[PDB]
Amino acid sequence: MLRWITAGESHGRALVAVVEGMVAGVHVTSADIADQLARRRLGYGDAVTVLSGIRHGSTLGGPIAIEIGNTEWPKWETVMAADPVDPAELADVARNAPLTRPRPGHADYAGMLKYGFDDARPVLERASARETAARVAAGTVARAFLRQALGVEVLSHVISIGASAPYEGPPPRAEDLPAIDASPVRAYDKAAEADMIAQIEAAKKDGDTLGGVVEAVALGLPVGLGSFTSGDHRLDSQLAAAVMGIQAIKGVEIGDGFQTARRRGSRAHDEMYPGPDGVVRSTNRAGGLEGGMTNGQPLRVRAAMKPISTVPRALATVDLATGDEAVAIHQRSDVCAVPAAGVVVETMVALVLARAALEKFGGDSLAETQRNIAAYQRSVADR
């Protein structure tokens, strides 16, 4: 089974992603990884070393380990040293001071209590969204597989930021990605773009921060990934887990999501009609999933992100050392990370889709998986 794991602290030496269970023969390079890491850095308001699992630009079949360096490591090499440091030397280092005032909205408080820590540092170092870089590295392998095996593309666009009027037009196609990635807020629609940029400008002036909604779209999927046989096998379950597990995400929808719940059955679903090469539909309210399976239509997954950067001077907290009232201090200064969150959602979607495809189509090498896919597609067409 395809599996992924990330490791690293925000201010540690490096991050590591390991992907286990990918077939041999998938073409992927350090340059591909770096490119996706560059996309994760997009938005208005990462030295890669492949350590294992890839040879001469082709996966080997074994575990793929990717390291992502921390460029600021020299500043942190004592405070975040793996090995013991003389506590007296450490006592003279201002950077190593105690963080005992948890930020509302973050892991700090619950993580400190959970693990019995008197300092937020060990919590925030691992909880931080810097970890999504390691996710994106892993996701690159999944992306390559999906394209080479299935001709599938995963992209995203931003629906809303702050109080912007949500973009409710049709989703983009793959060929629209260059224009989206060139948008300061990775919007597909120019009117929504302007509205969102205005929201960011206003927040920036007010010294405030914003969240937003993003949509990942996966195109070209075969019918029948996921299953109806149990709750855990439904692809929507799997996608929900992968997307909700992203830092700052507080909601996930498939297709028209919560709006579908307000609609009558007569207008809620996607009717089917005859076509040359199979059943066709004129709507995709379902967002490409029915009964837990891909149905041939674009997969559409939406994620709601809370504002992720803490606001200066606004939020009351408690100094856990004393029990006294305090005010929370920020660790990040960006007004909005929604555009980049879209890229992270793409990654998580790709990983789940790749896993589901390997579950159905099997194989130990790409050529084998491809034969299996072709035979399945033939069997469907011959219906």
* Annotated binding residues: 40, 126-128, 247-248, 291, 306-310, 332
Among 78, 96, 237, 365, binds Na ion (CB under 5 A): 365
Size of the site for Na ion (CB under 5 A): 8
Please answer whether residues 136 and 10 qualify as being in contact, where contact means their C-beta atoms are separated by less than 8 angstroms: no
The site partner of 298 among a copy of itself, Na ion, none (C-beta below 5 to 8 Å per kind) is Na ion
The site partner of 55 among Na ion, a copy of itself, none (C-beta below 5 to 8 Å per kind) is none
The site partner of 365 among Na ion, a copy of itself, none (C-beta below 5 to 8 Å per kind) is Na ion
Which positions from 229 to 268 touch Na ion by CB under 5 A, shown as an x/- string?
----------------------------------------
The helix or strand, by DSSP H or E, that contains position 236, with its residue range, turns out to be helix 235-244
Count of Cβ atoms closer than 10 Å to residue 30 Cβ: 16
Nearer to a copy of itself by C-beta: 36 or 347? 347
Cα–Cα dist 383/372, whole Å: 17
Interacting positions 151-210 with Na ion (CB under 5 A)? 171
The site partner of 309 among a copy of itself, Na ion, none (C-beta below 5 to 8 Å per kind) is a copy of itself
Cα–Cα dist 146/358, whole Å: 10
Binding to a copy of itself by residue 221, rule CB under 8 A? no
Cα–Cα dist 195/327, whole Å: 32
Residues comprising the chain, all counted: 383
Interacting positions 106-145 with a copy of itself (CB under 8 A)? 106-111, 113-116, 123, 126-127, 135
Binding residues for FMN: 126-128, 247-248, 291, 306-310, 332
Interacting positions 241-270 with a copy of itself (CB under 8 A)? 241-247, 249-258, 260-266, 268-270
Binding to a copy of itself by residue 295, rule CB under 8 A? yes
Binding to a copy of itself by residue 105, rule CB under 8 A? yes
Binding to a copy of itself by residue 163, rule CB under 8 A? yes
Give long-range contacts, CB 8 A cutoff, 24+ apart: 63-66. Answer: 63/18, 63/19, 63/20, 64/17, 64/18, 64/19, 64/20, 64/22, 64/141, 65/16, 65/17, 65/18, 66/16, 66/17, 66/18, 66/19, 66/33, 66/134, 66/137, 66/138
Nearest 5 degrees, angle CA 372-CA 376-CA 378?
115
Nearer to a copy of itself by C-beta: 146 or 243? 243
Binding to a copy of itself by residue 378, rule CB under 8 A? no
Matching residue, tokens 């920020």: 330
Interacting positions 295-324 with Na ion (CB under 5 A)? 298
The strand pairing partners of 95, in sequence order, are none
Nearer to Na ion by C-beta: 7 or 179? 7
Binding to Na ion by residue 25, rule CB under 5 A? yes
Among 95, 325, 374, 375, binds a copy of itself (CB under 8 A): 325
Cα–Cα dist 338/185, whole Å: 8
The helix or strand, by DSSP H or E, that contains position 217, with its residue range, turns out to be strand 212-219
* Strand residues in 307-380 grouped as ranges (E): 316-319, 324-327
Binding to Na ion by residue 7, rule CB under 5 A? yes
Binding to a copy of itself by residue 307, rule CB under 8 A? yes
